RNA sequence: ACCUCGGGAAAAGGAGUGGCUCUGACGGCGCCGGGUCAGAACUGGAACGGACGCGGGGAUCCCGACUGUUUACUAGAAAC
RNA sequence: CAUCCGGUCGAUCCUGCCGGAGCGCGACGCUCUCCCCAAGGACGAAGCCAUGCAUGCCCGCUCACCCGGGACGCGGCGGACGGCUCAGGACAACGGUUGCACCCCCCGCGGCGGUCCCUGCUAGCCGGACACCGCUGGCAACCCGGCGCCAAGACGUGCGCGCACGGGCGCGCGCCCCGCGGGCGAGCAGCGUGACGCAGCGACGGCCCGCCCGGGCUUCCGGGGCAUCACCCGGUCGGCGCGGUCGCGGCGCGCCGAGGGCCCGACGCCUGGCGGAGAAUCAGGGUUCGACUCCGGAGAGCGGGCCUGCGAGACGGCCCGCACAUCCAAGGACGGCAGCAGGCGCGGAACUUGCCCAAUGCGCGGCGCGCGAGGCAGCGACGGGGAGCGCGCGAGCGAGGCGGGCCCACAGCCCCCGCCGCGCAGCCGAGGGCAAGGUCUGUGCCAGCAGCCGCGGUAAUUCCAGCUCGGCGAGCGUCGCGCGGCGCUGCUGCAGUUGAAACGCCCGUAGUUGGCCCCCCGCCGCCACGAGGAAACGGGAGCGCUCCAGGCAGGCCCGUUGGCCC
RNA sequence: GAAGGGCCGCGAGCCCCCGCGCCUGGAGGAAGGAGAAGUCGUAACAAGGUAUCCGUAGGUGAACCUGCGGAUGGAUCCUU
């Protein structure tokens, strides 16, 4: 009854076991300073995505080589991590997936990519520009600062053609 | 109505069972209809052969015999079989009450008129035990069919060591 | 539940139909016909889902009612009509003729055939019985009862029906060295020659079949379906039931996406 | 029982919480044919049949004799 | 010592079932004496009419007058003693005015200097007590 | 319930019962005795231990344990 | 996805619990910028119901009228599915695995289509006999009575070909067993003959058989707790003969025998007890919950009983008893929301008497309707997901509004496009645990706070305000409970000299446990690998819904996919 | 062949007994816990002024005392 019931849903964040650890409160604030994050949930999501990927890597490393699952599932984890750019292209092994940080999840995010391309003066600048849809990846405008681009789309990231090139010519304050 | 369900029965250990459901049409049982033999044909003709069809599962009609008077009786050795009036029920293994009321049930020893089988007397060397019953006008036979389900009272003439067992049972009277 | 079940839930319907979970609460329930619910796909799914000739269920009725579709050469107007292994699904107006065989994964595949192929239909004799006055009769998987079968044809053999005349054109026996496609079961679609017949009296006969690649596959003899004596004598899917491994399947998927 | 026998089928049941097993017994009611002679302890072979009684769905098709003073022994047969 | 035989699973399963009861927590979770005894009867909270406003003394070494109301729970007609929390909150609660009472937070044990009060008022006459204290809604 | 474990107890309570017509059991067989105990029909103004013979019962308290014995001819008792 | 920390003391080391700290999924308080997704009167009231609606469709038969527009009625099929709920039920239900040589089945598919008679055919095709209908009534209502006309693919009969042919009968294998076979693993099926019977269908040909689908049982293993329940059951356990059923069977009865089940827990009781696929939490091992989506069971106030049908012991069928309604003109009638809204009661707790058959099914019907199935909208901080509350130094949005487009059964939302343009935060804390003032008042063991330890008795780091500050965040606090914590239940993995705790001793059955030894064999467990058995879910291949939770898509493509696992 | 009747079968509901579970009213007894700040002694802990304590029996305002047999957790690891 109601196909809505059959639609799935999941939690994408994992709160810390201890919430008031001073070393782990300060480090999260630094990781909000360099990445322009609104709330700690965004860092928790980053650790949930990394932990799952690391758990796949650890359950495959324990498995013997030439066991078919290690060859197939491991190649699919590596390919995904290479396509996103989380895994450096040169490493090409399962062990290097275990030795990764949430810095690699954050770097692929669009807000950090715009600063690297020098389009954004800061990460705080980029967040506002993406909310104002001034950024297009591969010809598609994005409004999400956690879009996370793939290595191929890195070059195709550009200022939205219809936004800051002034095709409108009367944008916001200029109009009036 | 009547139920052949084992839910009412106790377990092997003798424990009580639990009534998880109400009675179902599939586990229905029907009131038994004892085929009474019409031995009163001379007294009245109002009681004629009355067989009643009943509606069952799958629309499979079952013929229930309420009153019967005749049956096809077969002497297997001689291969002589003829429709014969059934005179009386003498001996039923389950109870003597069925013999008194003259109910026709499968395996009830019945006495049949020998007038159809009178021809067999002419050929000798055809089982002396059957032949002297033929002369007497009553032959020991047993109903071989179920009157309640089939609607007929077909049988066979008791022969060999069977005839001896049932004639010994009815020997004193 | 008081009687026969007239409805099928989408989550309940068999996986080989490949019905999307969000598509509906309900799934098409096949009518009773030549094939069983598990061993058949309805005509609505073989038209609206595979060929997309009808974009909605009402349009499947409109094209089925017009007898445009022909199944085994029969008009077969029922929307939920079962279509199964070896049935000839041909639409003359679009000039397309299809024979339903099983693919390597195990889903049904509408294979393009030729006019000579369309004429014959392959059937497996499940049982030979003395019914109707002790007259000999055979029973094929597609619910076909043929009286007076050739005395030799045994059970498990494959007969070929003329369709127009409904006569057995030829019989292929079930024996070692005979081309067989396993219909149903974990090994489904796979094509191989019988290499072993293990009786296991009182239970199920276990048939081991060998692919051209040399991969040995074992299945119960009910699923096994003889195709011919040394060659299929029927159209076989492009894969020809060699069956790919998971790493090979990954490679074919990557190749297809790259040429987008 | 008259023309009937009770068979003690012995089987192990495995639990996961404790990697050990539980020795378990089930008494199944069979029908002794008058042809077969049996003593309490013999290994019988029982084959499924139509319900023959409330508790009997089996019939003895083979008898293996034992030395009477055969101890007991949990035996999966 | 413990039993370690490949076929002694039954003993270990029985020992665990028997000795599980020694803990008060397993008993206060499965015995069911608590469910019948509790005036909340396993509910998250209950509703009930005020009968008496009582000044309850704090336990030593604390010297104070904690403020509470005796409440007869509509659900089981059972009078409990419930502390009214915060400062001057009792003034909001009148007599016979209906109060929603939840437990203190020790799962049915009396908490703090207050003795025997396992319950505290959360809503007076359908109005949250904390709201009447923060002056968000009037009485 | 209680109890000295013997009792209480016919506890308390219910149900059937006639006449006919049969059917089983049970010894000593060819024979030949038995008169009890079951079971079934069928009947009868809704009748049956049809007269007769033949406990009303239950809960307490006091006293004397009990069976006995006694003031023949006013006390059978808790008295002896 | 392997973490602890505060509290017994003068101090210390322990045991040991208490309290914290994480997550769930409900209640509650307070507050809320926008979009996406989405549960939703289950929770000791399976209490109760006002109102509307949830099951129709068809035309074989039209001298109803619109001329075939066809009203109705008759006939057909469906109303046994689906929707709902979880009361009952603890060797039951249910899940995997079996069997039916013990079975039943509408639709459809594919076969098959010989039906004695006497009387008595009309087969170029037979009767009568009702409904609607007309006419005349009773009737508070409900309900229907009489008379008259006239039809069906309806009804009643019947023209049939003695290899006529439904049922059930009687008879027809053996020679120690196993090896062609219509068929099997197996003596099963079919038929030949002798009697019986005379079934069906043939008045617009279906009996019949296979297949299918559902059912009925049935085989094995799993299938709550309590011993302050240790002995239990007597159709109970077997056998035999009947009956009965769709059929097997103590299912039932008659008769004979005394079995059957138990510390490997019988039986009894109890269950704020549907089961499973699953879910919560989590290193591993585990624990707890299984009202709800899919599957199987059960029930429609409670007991029964029934009819119709192929299938119902049916309740949107009927009959009856009880409980409780309803109307009444007082004679009578008349129900049954654990369908969907909605109300009432109860509780801590739970949505609109909305719309619509367009999708997805199903019932009937080639041209198409019906559906409170299902879809859409509303409500809705159950919850999940994605963005805001600026960037910066002069430019920019989106929140809106207003238009168009798109979308839609109809709107709407989303999104696209022009035009105006108007960012906007809570809730808990700051002595420790546990992140954050030794700030300034008030108060003065009072008031209060404080899960815990503790603060308050005039220099309150703990209260009541201000100030400042921390955490998390459009959410945060509180309560209840499950899991983790907790090697504080210990299989992994606990302890018993003294902290809680070796039975006073000995024998001893059940139980559990038993040295070494034979390579090469049969049975067991065992490990590996297969078959075969629903998905969803949980993974997981591949695919940029703008990301995302999702979904199974997509793009000129393996026969594009949707693999594979559990 | 209708109403109706009979006998059985399936089987409500009511009655009457008897169990069984659950919840309770109740003089008058009788423990435990929390106050209060009371009264009467001072039992134990220092050889606690009679070393404690264990079983068992008796007694006694009350902690307790005493008999008999233990133990040391004693106040003794120690003497032809």
Numbering used by the authors:
A (entry chain SK): 1 to 176
B (entry chain SI): 2 to 174
C (entry chain SE): 2 to 261
D (entry chain SM): 78 to 154
E (entry chain SO): 2 to 140
Authors' own words:
Giardia intestinalis is a protozoan parasite that causes diarrhea in humans.
The most populated state (A-I) shows a completely closed L1-stalk and E-site tRNA, while the other substates (II through VI) show snapshots of a continuum of movement of the L1 stalk with the final state (A-VI) having no bound tRNAs and an L1-stalk angle of 39°. Interestingly, the A state(s) exhibit an additional rotation of the SSU with a different rotational axis, which is similar to previously reported eukaryote-specific ‘subunit rolling’. To understand whether Giardia ribosomes exhibit subunit rolling, we compared the classical PRE-T state ‘C’ with the POST-T state ‘A-I’. A clear 4.6° rotation of the SSU toward the A site could be observed in transition from the POST-T to the PRE-T state, along with formation of the B6 and B8 bridges.
